[PDB]
């Protein structure tokens, strides 16, 4: 049961890392223009329920990946995982920081998130 969550988290981590690795391969008029896109960062992200704050920024993530290229299926998969992991009991009320982030900073935040949860179970 916890292993099921652990494996789901492992796929999530890997999916985010794939996107991040796919970002370094780009040119220079692509990378610079891509980094101007601003993402919302969660004020608090320490437990599984906070993955709502990932779901709520998948649309801009998919948007930015489409303008940089399938991205539809990778983000689709992240959604499926996130929906499973976030729990279906109550909707978590997401709070975001005043300082926005690049796509790199955004990914690095959620990569650090997954690794932190995996460590605690
Ligand atoms: N849904 C959001 N995360 N909201 C942000 C949002 O609406 N994003 C917009 C944004 O960051 N833009 C608008 C589109 C701009 C753009 C960049 C590109 C582009 C063009 C060629 C290649 C590539 Cl990869 C890209 Cl990303 N096309 N258009 C970049 C900056 C706002 C957050 C709060 C402050 C204001 C932004």
Swiss-Prot record:
What molecular functions are annotated in GO for this chain?
carbohydrate binding; cytokine activity; glycosphingolipid binding; growth factor activity; interleukin-2 receptor binding; kappa-type opioid receptor binding; kinase activator activity
Gene from which the chain derives: IL2
So which disease is it linked with? A chromosomal aberration involving IL2 is found in a form of T-cell acute lymphoblastic leukemia (T-ALL). Translocation t(4;16)(q26;p13) with involves TNFRSF17.
Stated family: Belongs to the IL-2 family.
Q: Name one GO biological process term.
A: positive regulation of interleukin-17 production
- What function is annotated for this protein? Cytokine produced by activated CD4-positive helper T-cells and to a lesser extend activated CD8-positive T-cells and natural killer (NK) cells that plays pivotal roles in the immune response and tolerance. Binds to a receptor complex composed of either the high-affinity trimeric IL-2R (IL2RA/CD25, IL2RB/CD122 and IL2RG/CD132) or the low-affinity dimeric IL-2R (IL2RB and IL2RG). Interaction with the receptor leads to oligomerization and conformation changes in the IL-2R subunits resulting in downstream signaling starting with phosphorylation of JAK1 and JAK3.
Q: What is this protein called?
A: Interleukin-2
Q: Name one GO cellular component term.
A: extracellular region
Q: Which cysteines are joined by disulfide bonds?
A: 53-94
Keyword list, A-Z: Adaptive immunity, Chromosomal rearrangement, Cytokine, Disulfide bond, Glycoprotein, Growth factor, Immunity, Pharmaceutical, Proto-oncogene, Secreted, Signal
Q: Where in the cell is it found?
A: Secreted
Residues shown, of full length: 26 to 152 of 153
């Amino acid at each position: 049961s916890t292993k099921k969550t652990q494996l789901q988290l492992e796929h999530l981590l890997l999916d985010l890392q794939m996107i991040l690795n796919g970002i370094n391969n780009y040119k220079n008029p692509k990378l610079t223009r891509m980094l101007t896109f601003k993402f919302y960062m969660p004020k608090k992200a320490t437990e599984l329920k906070h993955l709502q704050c990932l779901e709520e920024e998948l649309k801009p993530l998919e948007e930015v990946l489409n303008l940089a290229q399938r991205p539809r299926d990778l983000i689709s998969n992240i959604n499926v995982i996130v929906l499973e992991l976030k729990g279906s009991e109550t909707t978590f009320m997401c709070e975001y920081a005043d300082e926005t982030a690049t796509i790199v900073e955004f990914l690095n935040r959620w990569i650090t998130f997954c690794q932190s949860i995996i460590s605690t179970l």
